[PDB]
């Protein structure tokens, strides 16, 4: 194998579970309550259209610009306080480096934002190549992002392993010609959609290390 490629969010660390607390703090800053029942529904749509809905749902009287800024502030605080690396992922990154194999990161998250997170978690130092969502024209499921990772690594897709956590991520890597895609899951029985998109197996973050020991 010549390289191992990781998605960031949902593999190296998980931000999705902290969204409730971030949005709860926003509501609280305006003297408003917030429920998981509303939040579960708010999360079924992109944040761009989700935020304005949240503001009106909560009967908040502010400009959207001011609201978005508060959301920005509360996410920083929450992530800074509570975002931690997933168990076993550091050992997995250390293992790839121990084999003198190249290590790459691919994420839909824009560069500046993504680097802040990785730096706080001290995971940035492992990677040889990192590609971010603002570095391609069309994002997942378009294969552009994985094609650029392959380009920057200067490796053929049949010699890389990818750890992905979304349907669109798996589709993108597969469309780029990469076959060895593992779907990273977080709960009792999620992951069917990743397998249907072409993942060759499901793994928890803690199981990634043993996968690498098997395939590298």
Short mmCIF file of the C-alpha atoms (twelve columns), coordinates in Angstrom:
data_MODEL
# 
_entry.id   MODEL 
# 
loop_
_atom_site.group_PDB 
_atom_site.id 
_atom_site.type_symbol 
_atom_site.label_atom_id 
_atom_site.label_alt_id 
_atom_site.label_comp_id 
_atom_site.label_asym_id 
_atom_site.label_seq_id 
_atom_site.Cartn_x 
_atom_site.Cartn_y 
_atom_site.Cartn_z 
_atom_site.pdbx_PDB_model_num 
ATOM 1   C CA . UNK A 1   0.000   0.000  0.000  1 
ATOM 2   C CA . UNK A 2   1.341   3.482  -0.687 1 
ATOM 3   C CA . UNK A 3   -1.101  5.721  1.107  1 
ATOM 4   C CA . UNK A 4   -3.921  5.845  3.620  1 
ATOM 5   C CA . UNK A 5   -6.547  8.599  3.291  1 
ATOM 6   C CA . UNK A 6   -8.844  9.729  6.144  1 
ATOM 7   C CA . UNK A 7   -11.966 11.816 6.117  1 
ATOM 8   C CA . UNK A 8   -11.846 14.290 9.041  1 
ATOM 9   C CA . UNK A 9   -15.216 14.771 10.646 1 
ATOM 10  C CA . UNK A 10  -16.761 11.545 11.787 1 
ATOM 11  C CA . UNK A 11  -13.488 9.637  11.588 1 
ATOM 12  C CA . UNK A 12  -10.767 11.584 13.377 1 
ATOM 13  C CA . UNK A 13  -13.249 13.338 15.670 1 
ATOM 14  C CA . UNK A 14  -17.014 13.884 15.686 1 
ATOM 15  C CA . UNK A 15  -18.567 17.379 15.713 1 
ATOM 16  C CA . UNK A 16  -22.139 16.319 14.911 1 
ATOM 17  C CA . UNK A 17  -22.908 15.262 18.515 1 
ATOM 18  C CA . UNK A 18  -21.855 18.713 19.803 1 
ATOM 19  C CA . UNK A 19  -24.260 20.659 17.612 1 
ATOM 20  C CA . UNK A 20  -27.057 20.368 20.172 1 
ATOM 21  C CA . UNK A 21  -24.991 22.043 22.897 1 
ATOM 22  C CA . UNK A 22  -23.784 24.783 20.497 1 
ATOM 23  C CA . UNK A 23  -27.347 25.597 19.361 1 
ATOM 24  C CA . UNK A 24  -28.669 25.249 22.941 1 
ATOM 25  C CA . UNK A 25  -26.131 27.886 24.055 1 
ATOM 26  C CA . UNK A 26  -27.156 30.203 21.217 1 
ATOM 27  C CA . UNK A 27  -30.821 29.932 22.255 1 
ATOM 28  C CA . UNK A 28  -29.829 30.393 25.906 1 
ATOM 29  C CA . UNK A 29  -27.862 33.556 25.039 1 
ATOM 30  C CA . UNK A 30  -31.178 35.021 23.744 1 
ATOM 31  C CA . UNK A 31  -33.121 33.878 26.836 1 
ATOM 32  C CA . UNK A 32  -34.755 31.006 24.859 1 
ATOM 33  C CA . UNK A 33  -35.180 27.279 25.581 1 
ATOM 34  C CA . UNK A 34  -34.233 24.575 23.083 1 
ATOM 35  C CA . UNK A 35  -35.285 20.905 22.791 1 
ATOM 36  C CA . UNK A 36  -33.603 17.793 21.316 1 
ATOM 37  C CA . UNK A 37  -36.862 17.082 19.457 1 
ATOM 38  C CA . UNK A 38  -36.557 20.378 17.543 1 
ATOM 39  C CA . UNK A 39  -32.838 19.972 17.202 1 
ATOM 40  C CA . UNK A 40  -33.099 16.459 15.653 1 
ATOM 41  C CA . UNK A 41  -35.311 17.986 12.968 1 
ATOM 42  C CA . UNK A 42  -33.166 21.104 12.472 1 
ATOM 43  C CA . UNK A 43  -30.215 18.791 11.795 1 
ATOM 44  C CA . UNK A 44  -31.971 17.093 8.846  1 
ATOM 45  C CA . UNK A 45  -31.122 20.116 6.629  1 
ATOM 46  C CA . UNK A 46  -27.984 22.083 5.638  1 
ATOM 47  C CA . UNK A 47  -26.839 24.645 8.214  1 
ATOM 48  C CA . UNK A 48  -27.136 27.497 5.684  1 
ATOM 49  C CA . UNK A 49  -30.971 27.156 5.623  1 
ATOM 50  C CA . UNK A 50  -31.131 25.608 9.105  1 
ATOM 51  C CA . UNK A 51  -29.867 28.673 10.971 1 
ATOM 52  C CA . UNK A 52  -32.521 31.125 9.727  1 
ATOM 53  C CA . UNK A 53  -35.203 28.527 10.576 1 
ATOM 54  C CA . UNK A 54  -33.755 28.065 14.073 1 
ATOM 55  C CA . UNK A 55  -33.842 31.830 14.614 1 
ATOM 56  C CA . UNK A 56  -37.532 32.092 13.676 1 
ATOM 57  C CA . UNK A 57  -38.488 28.836 15.422 1 
ATOM 58  C CA . UNK A 58  -37.098 30.331 18.656 1 
ATOM 59  C CA . UNK A 59  -38.804 33.704 18.062 1 
ATOM 60  C CA . UNK A 60  -35.464 35.479 18.276 1 
ATOM 61  C CA . UNK A 61  -35.539 39.139 17.275 1 
ATOM 62  C CA . UNK A 62  -32.098 39.912 15.882 1 
ATOM 63  C CA . UNK A 63  -30.618 40.283 12.400 1 
ATOM 64  C CA . UNK A 64  -29.601 37.049 10.651 1 
ATOM 65  C CA . UNK A 65  -26.058 38.450 10.474 1 
ATOM 66  C CA . UNK A 66  -25.920 38.895 14.253 1 
ATOM 67  C CA . UNK A 67  -27.497 35.462 14.806 1 
ATOM 68  C CA . UNK A 68  -24.977 33.705 12.518 1 
ATOM 69  C CA . UNK A 69  -22.166 35.410 14.405 1 
ATOM 70  C CA . UNK A 70  -23.515 34.090 17.723 1 
ATOM 71  C CA . UNK A 71  -23.779 30.595 16.290 1 
ATOM 72  C CA . UNK A 72  -20.168 30.966 15.127 1 
ATOM 73  C CA . UNK A 73  -19.042 32.049 18.635 1 
ATOM 74  C CA . UNK A 74  -20.914 29.276 20.484 1 
ATOM 75  C CA . UNK A 75  -19.632 26.518 18.153 1 
ATOM 76  C CA . UNK A 76  -16.039 27.675 18.774 1 
ATOM 77  C CA . UNK A 77  -16.516 27.542 22.534 1 
ATOM 78  C CA . UNK A 78  -18.280 24.192 22.541 1 
ATOM 79  C CA . UNK A 79  -15.773 22.595 20.103 1 
ATOM 80  C CA . UNK A 80  -12.857 24.082 21.963 1 
ATOM 81  C CA . UNK A 81  -14.244 22.756 25.263 1 
ATOM 82  C CA . UNK A 82  -15.606 19.358 24.240 1 
ATOM 83  C CA . UNK A 83  -14.217 18.210 20.879 1 
ATOM 84  C CA . UNK A 84  -11.803 15.336 21.395 1 
ATOM 85  C CA . UNK A 85  -10.127 12.893 19.057 1 
ATOM 86  C CA . UNK A 86  -11.936 9.563  18.556 1 
ATOM 87  C CA . UNK A 87  -10.463 6.638  20.520 1 
ATOM 88  C CA . UNK A 88  -7.731  4.679  18.691 1 
ATOM 89  C CA . UNK A 89  -7.399  7.140  15.831 1 
ATOM 90  C CA . UNK A 90  -4.055  8.606  16.977 1 
ATOM 91  C CA . UNK A 91  -2.600  5.051  17.238 1 
ATOM 92  C CA . UNK A 92  -3.825  4.368  13.714 1 
ATOM 93  C CA . UNK A 93  -2.171  7.528  12.340 1 
ATOM 94  C CA . UNK A 94  1.017   6.661  14.241 1 
ATOM 95  C CA . UNK A 95  0.917   3.158  12.746 1 
ATOM 96  C CA . UNK A 96  0.700   4.344  9.111  1 
ATOM 97  C CA . UNK A 97  3.691   6.646  9.723  1 
ATOM 98  C CA . UNK A 98  5.571   3.726  11.377 1 
ATOM 99  C CA . UNK A 99  5.235   1.863  8.035  1 
ATOM 100 C CA . UNK A 100 6.687   4.801  6.103  1 
ATOM 101 C CA . UNK A 101 3.467   5.025  4.112  1 
ATOM 102 C CA . UNK A 102 2.008   8.439  3.136  1 
ATOM 103 C CA . UNK A 103 -0.921  9.760  5.163  1 
ATOM 104 C CA . UNK A 104 -3.546  12.075 3.747  1 
ATOM 105 C CA . UNK A 105 -6.623  13.940 4.991  1 
ATOM 106 C CA . UNK A 106 -9.632  14.785 2.799  1 
ATOM 107 C CA . UNK A 107 -12.459 16.935 4.179  1 
ATOM 108 C CA . UNK A 108 -15.362 18.972 2.836  1 
ATOM 109 C CA . UNK A 109 -14.625 21.508 5.613  1 
ATOM 110 C CA . UNK A 110 -12.802 24.662 4.363  1 
ATOM 111 C CA . UNK A 111 -9.107  24.822 5.011  1 
ATOM 112 C CA . UNK A 112 -8.870  27.504 7.687  1 
ATOM 113 C CA . UNK A 113 -11.711 26.092 9.793  1 
ATOM 114 C CA . UNK A 114 -10.455 22.484 9.464  1 
ATOM 115 C CA . UNK A 115 -6.863  23.332 10.407 1 
ATOM 116 C CA . UNK A 116 -8.043  25.111 13.604 1 
ATOM 117 C CA . UNK A 117 -9.738  21.867 14.750 1 
ATOM 118 C CA . UNK A 118 -6.847  19.614 13.833 1 
ATOM 119 C CA . UNK A 119 -4.352  21.949 15.528 1 
ATOM 120 C CA . UNK A 120 -6.356  22.044 18.779 1 
ATOM 121 C CA . UNK A 121 -6.340  18.227 18.756 1 
ATOM 122 C CA . UNK A 122 -2.672  17.974 17.724 1 
ATOM 123 C CA . UNK A 123 -3.561  15.674 14.754 1 
ATOM 124 C CA . UNK A 124 -2.264  18.011 12.070 1 
ATOM 125 C CA . UNK A 125 1.368   16.894 12.411 1 
ATOM 126 C CA . UNK A 126 0.732   13.391 11.009 1 
ATOM 127 C CA . UNK A 127 -0.358  14.255 7.510  1 
ATOM 128 C CA . UNK A 128 1.737   14.463 4.368  1 
ATOM 129 C CA . UNK A 129 -1.137  15.654 2.183  1 
ATOM 130 C CA . UNK A 130 -4.326  17.442 3.200  1 
ATOM 131 C CA . UNK A 131 -7.129  18.541 0.828  1 
ATOM 132 C CA . UNK A 132 -10.030 20.777 1.971  1 
ATOM 133 C CA . UNK A 133 -13.495 21.527 0.621  1 
ATOM 134 C CA . UNK A 134 -12.647 25.013 -0.621 1 
ATOM 135 C CA . UNK A 135 -9.894  23.534 -2.806 1 
ATOM 136 C CA . UNK A 136 -12.223 21.852 -5.329 1 
ATOM 137 C CA . UNK A 137 -14.913 23.170 -7.693 1 
ATOM 138 C CA . UNK A 138 -17.484 20.435 -6.920 1 
ATOM 139 C CA . UNK A 139 -17.605 18.658 -3.541 1 
ATOM 140 C CA . UNK A 140 -18.698 15.111 -2.559 1 
ATOM 141 C CA . UNK A 141 -20.094 12.962 -4.166 1 
ATOM 142 C CA . UNK A 142 -18.088 14.372 -7.094 1 
ATOM 143 C CA . UNK A 143 -14.702 12.486 -7.203 1 
ATOM 144 C CA . UNK A 144 -12.772 15.832 -7.549 1 
ATOM 145 C CA . UNK A 145 -11.629 15.875 -3.913 1 
ATOM 146 C CA . UNK A 146 -10.216 12.320 -3.973 1 
ATOM 147 C CA . UNK A 147 -8.656  12.876 -7.443 1 
ATOM 148 C CA . UNK A 148 -6.816  15.905 -5.957 1 
ATOM 149 C CA . UNK A 149 -5.685  13.834 -2.916 1 
ATOM 150 C CA . UNK A 150 -4.350  11.165 -5.353 1 
ATOM 151 C CA . UNK A 151 -2.645  13.910 -7.384 1 
ATOM 152 C CA . UNK A 152 -0.945  15.515 -4.433 1 
ATOM 153 C CA . UNK A 153 0.143   12.093 -3.060 1 
ATOM 154 C CA . UNK A 154 1.291   10.992 -6.533 1 
ATOM 155 C CA . UNK A 155 -0.162  7.495  -5.973 1 
ATOM 156 C CA . UNK A 156 -2.495  5.203  -7.965 1 
ATOM 157 C CA . UNK A 157 -5.955  4.535  -6.486 1 
ATOM 158 C CA . UNK A 158 -5.452  0.755  -6.263 1 
ATOM 159 C CA . UNK A 159 -2.633  1.427  -3.736 1 
ATOM 160 C CA . UNK A 160 -4.608  3.552  -1.219 1 
ATOM 161 C CA . UNK A 161 -7.010  2.735  1.597  1 
ATOM 162 C CA . UNK A 162 -9.732  5.294  2.492  1 
ATOM 163 C CA . UNK A 163 -11.693 5.696  5.772  1 
ATOM 164 C CA . UNK A 164 -14.930 7.450  5.038  1 
ATOM 165 C CA . UNK A 165 -18.083 8.116  7.057  1 
ATOM 166 C CA . UNK A 166 -20.743 9.374  4.600  1 
ATOM 167 C CA . UNK A 167 -22.595 7.977  1.562  1 
ATOM 168 C CA . UNK A 168 -21.406 10.960 -0.513 1 
ATOM 169 C CA . UNK A 169 -17.790 10.460 0.708  1 
ATOM 170 C CA . UNK A 170 -17.796 6.782  -0.230 1 
ATOM 171 C CA . UNK A 171 -19.323 7.572  -3.598 1 
ATOM 172 C CA . UNK A 172 -16.660 10.204 -4.260 1 
ATOM 173 C CA . UNK A 173 -13.725 7.915  -3.420 1 
ATOM 174 C CA . UNK A 174 -15.233 5.052  -5.463 1 
ATOM 175 C CA . UNK A 175 -15.809 7.359  -8.469 1 
ATOM 176 C CA . UNK A 176 -12.124 8.410  -8.213 1 
ATOM 177 C CA . UNK A 177 -11.245 4.726  -8.809 1 
ATOM 178 C CA . UNK A 178 -10.416 3.783  -5.208 1 
ATOM 179 C CA . UNK A 179 -11.678 0.294  -4.236 1 
ATOM 180 C CA . UNK A 180 -10.465 -0.157 -0.664 1 
ATOM 181 C CA . UNK A 181 -12.957 2.089  1.172  1 
ATOM 182 C CA . UNK A 182 -13.891 1.375  4.792  1 
ATOM 183 C CA . UNK A 183 -17.055 2.879  6.201  1 
ATOM 184 C CA . UNK A 184 -16.548 4.352  9.672  1 
ATOM 185 C CA . UNK A 185 -19.592 4.081  11.923 1 
ATOM 186 C CA . UNK A 186 -20.571 5.341  15.319 1 
ATOM 187 C CA . UNK A 187 -23.523 3.411  16.664 1 
ATOM 188 C CA . UNK A 188 -25.161 0.037  17.135 1 
ATOM 189 C CA . UNK A 189 -26.351 -0.532 13.504 1 
ATOM 190 C CA . UNK A 190 -25.627 2.386  11.258 1 
ATOM 191 C CA . UNK A 191 -23.653 1.954  8.061  1 
ATOM 192 C CA . UNK A 192 -25.872 0.142  5.582  1 
ATOM 193 C CA . UNK A 193 -25.810 3.212  3.296  1 
ATOM 194 C CA . UNK A 194 -21.980 3.197  3.318  1 
ATOM 195 C CA . UNK A 195 -21.940 -0.460 2.260  1 
ATOM 196 C CA . UNK A 196 -24.483 0.210  -0.464 1 
ATOM 197 C CA . UNK A 197 -22.257 3.033  -1.764 1 
ATOM 198 C CA . UNK A 198 -19.330 0.593  -2.053 1 
ATOM 199 C CA . UNK A 199 -17.596 0.442  1.306  1 
ATOM 200 C CA . UNK A 200 -15.872 -2.968 1.676  1 
ATOM 201 C CA . UNK A 201 -16.533 -3.231 5.405  1 
ATOM 202 C CA . UNK A 202 -17.796 -1.233 8.349  1 
ATOM 203 C CA . UNK A 203 -15.519 -0.276 11.245 1 
ATOM 204 C CA . UNK A 204 -15.667 1.787  14.460 1 
ATOM 205 C CA . UNK A 205 -12.853 4.360  14.870 1 
ATOM 206 C CA . UNK A 206 -11.277 2.058  17.507 1 
ATOM 207 C CA . UNK A 207 -11.154 -0.765 14.943 1 
ATOM 208 C CA . UNK A 208 -9.206  1.180  12.301 1 
ATOM 209 C CA . UNK A 209 -5.816  0.253  13.781 1 
ATOM 210 C CA . UNK A 210 -6.423  -3.495 13.401 1 
ATOM 211 C CA . UNK A 211 -7.650  -2.966 9.843  1 
ATOM 212 C CA . UNK A 212 -4.346  -1.230 9.039  1 
ATOM 213 C CA . UNK A 213 -2.318  -4.036 10.696 1 
ATOM 214 C CA . UNK A 214 -4.211  -6.455 8.419  1 
ATOM 215 C CA . UNK A 215 -3.848  -4.560 5.095  1 
ATOM 216 C CA . UNK A 216 -0.560  -2.600 5.227  1 
# 
